[PDB]
Design a protein around this ligand. Structure first.
Ligand SMILES: Cc1ncc(C[n+]2csc(CCOP(=O)(O)O)c2C)c(N)n1
Length: 308
């Protein structure tokens, strides 16, 4: 009967996402009405919450990630999770009293092997090659995968990011606010490549029995994303919010991540047959939450100037 409002992005709460599964699994156990609201894209979730303040109707924000931690905590809108750390297993480890991971992955450009014969083998080639590859990606101001690509490029080019961005802009068909639209245009054929995840091919393999889609493994390595959730300080249902966060890092939840969100679980659950066809990037790239919050505004400012 009591309601637990959870802000999240559209692909999570989608009928085909993990939402429906997690919902009934949480409600079937802990009596209450879990209300998953597909409100904004990853980065936008935070900006919207910062503007709702304590007037926000959210109890939990699901869908932020490792790159937004500093920005989120400095806001003061989140309370401690009350979730035991030992309940989580993530690459590079995880030590945080507020944000609880629920899955992780690696950003990568996906393409159709039946349509793209000689795909790029490094972010550098994709940007500098003379090939006229069509690319689509997300806005770093609204989408985590978008923010991911922004930081990925920063790792690879450093102070040369803007010049690299101008070159990438010439191969850019469009830029969407969220991943869903981006991926849809890709599947419709509007581009040769789209920024997505190393695990995206798994969706097509298991659900459509197709293995023609692939994520290009770049030699520079790939940027790591650890999605997280946290309860709000203004929540009027603290206890429930926290029972949801603990239940999140548990099997009933995690078991729906592989085929729901197409990402690697945070708990040692069994990965669906098919994931083994995927490529685990050797080298992993990541900025500290502090480094991103301190420079993301300037990097985004340079990005938009270079691609418009
Ligand atoms: C086929 C397929 N590949 C990958 C994923 C995972 N995924 C897609 S978008 C996203 C975060 C988006 O933040 P934002 O909405 O702001 O772009 C994640 C984790 C999926 N659901 N399906």
């Amino acid at each position: 009967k009591p309601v637990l409002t959870v802000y999240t992005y559209d692909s999570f709460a989608a009928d085909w996402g993990p939402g429906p599964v997690v919902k009934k699994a949480f409600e079937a156990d802990c009596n209450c009405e879990l209300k998953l609201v597909a409100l904004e894209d990853g980065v936008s979730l935070l900006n919207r919450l910062r503007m709702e303040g304590k007037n926000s109707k959210a109890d939990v924000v699901l869908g932020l990630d490792n790159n937004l931690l500093d920005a989120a905590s400095k806001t003061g809108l989140f309370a401690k999770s009350g979730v035991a750390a030992d309940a989580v297993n993530v690459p590079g480890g995880w030590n945080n009293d507020t944000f609880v991971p629920f899955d992780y992955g690696y950003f990568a450009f996906v393409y159709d092997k039946n349509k793209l014969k000689n795909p790029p083998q490094s972010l550098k080639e994709l940007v500098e090659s003379d090939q006229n590859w069509r690319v689509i990606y997300q806005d770093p101001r609204t989408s985590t995968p978008g923010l991911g690509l922004l930081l990925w490029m920063q790792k690879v080019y450093g102070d040369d990011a803007p010049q690299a961005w101008q070159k990438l802009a010439k191969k850019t068909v469009t830029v969407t606010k969220g991943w869903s639209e981006a991926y849809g245009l890709f599947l419709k054929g509007e581009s040769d490549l789209v920024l997505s995840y190393t695990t995206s091919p798994a969706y097509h393999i298991l659900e459509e029995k197709k293995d023609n889609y692939a994520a290009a493994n770049f030699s520079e390595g790939h940027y790591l994303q650890v999605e997280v959730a946290a309860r709000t300080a203004a929540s009027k249902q603290p206890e429930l919010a926290q029972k949801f966060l603990q239940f999140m890092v548990s099997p009933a939840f995690q078991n729906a991540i592989p085929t729901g969100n197409w990402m690697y679980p945070v708990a040692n659950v069994t990965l669906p047959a098919g994931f083994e066809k995927l490529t685990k990037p050797a080298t992993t790239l990541e900025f500290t939450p502090a480094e991103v919050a301190a420079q993301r505004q300037a990097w985004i400012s340079e990005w938009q100037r270079a691609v418009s």
